[PDB]
Write a protein that binds this ligand. Sequence first.
Ligand SMILES: CCc1cc(O)ccc1-c1ccc2c(-c3nc4ccccc4[nH]3)n[nH]c2c1
Length: 284
Amino acid sequence: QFEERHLKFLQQLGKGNFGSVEMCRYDPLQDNTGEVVAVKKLQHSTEEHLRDFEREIEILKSLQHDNIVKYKGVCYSAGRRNLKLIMEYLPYGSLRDYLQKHKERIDHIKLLQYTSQICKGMEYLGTKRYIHRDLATRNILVENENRVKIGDFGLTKVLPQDKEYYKVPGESPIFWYAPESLTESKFSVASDVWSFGVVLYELFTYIEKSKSPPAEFMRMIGNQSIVTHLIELLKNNGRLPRPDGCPDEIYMIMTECWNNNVNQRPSFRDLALRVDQVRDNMAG
Ligand SMILES: CCc1cc(O)ccc1-c1ccc2c(-c3nc4ccccc4[nH]3)n[nH]c2c1
């Protein structure tokens, strides 16, 4: 339990429509310093967003894995109605920024180390029947040069006991969404795997602006609405191209994640083995 008065503001870390993230020092003895944490609050405190936020917290609360970011607590000092979530602070930020600034020290082998760690996380989420729903390079955090961790779990949904998909706004990362998520609003491990396919695309393009999924899909779309154009482009087997210099065996994994049919997509266990193996062939 974190008390507002001891929660000292250092700087803004990242923002969005109704949530924001701040770097903070939690200083219960005020003497003169304590421990640095990442703090999420809601801007527009609508009750659906609050209820969604409270459900995000329970998910975070239930997670313990070396490749998943650590929950520390919550602050109720000033209300329900302005809850704060408190998580560990990882200094190197998101994989999107990190990769983009440090790229010339990061080769295909490093990129495959990151990929492995991502699959181990999603494996572990699969065990708890969680569908992350926002797998993208911008929601993977870097603890150090040899370790990254998932999370922005604000879209994460728990699977029903009886079903293997979840039916569910507001801004969606459509260019990372699988076809059945666009057309029918279904989410599954299968759709999480599709997203991972495009994460693999992001890393192997080195997050170059002009090569990005929005950048690329919008070129192919040419030339309403935009989703409707995407859904149709995907149905005619339109896909993100092979990144320059991307291996055969990696590109194949991408292509397999982006299979129209849910049931023919690879599983995260399989993706771990395949990627862990490609590393060794590349190294030794
Ligand atoms: C508290 C919000 C949240 C809520 C979830 O459900 C899951 C993860 C997070 C989260 C998001 C971002 C961070 C960061 C960080 N460190 C940076 C350095 C530089 C630039 C950006 C950074 N973001 N550390 N820990 C973080 C936890």
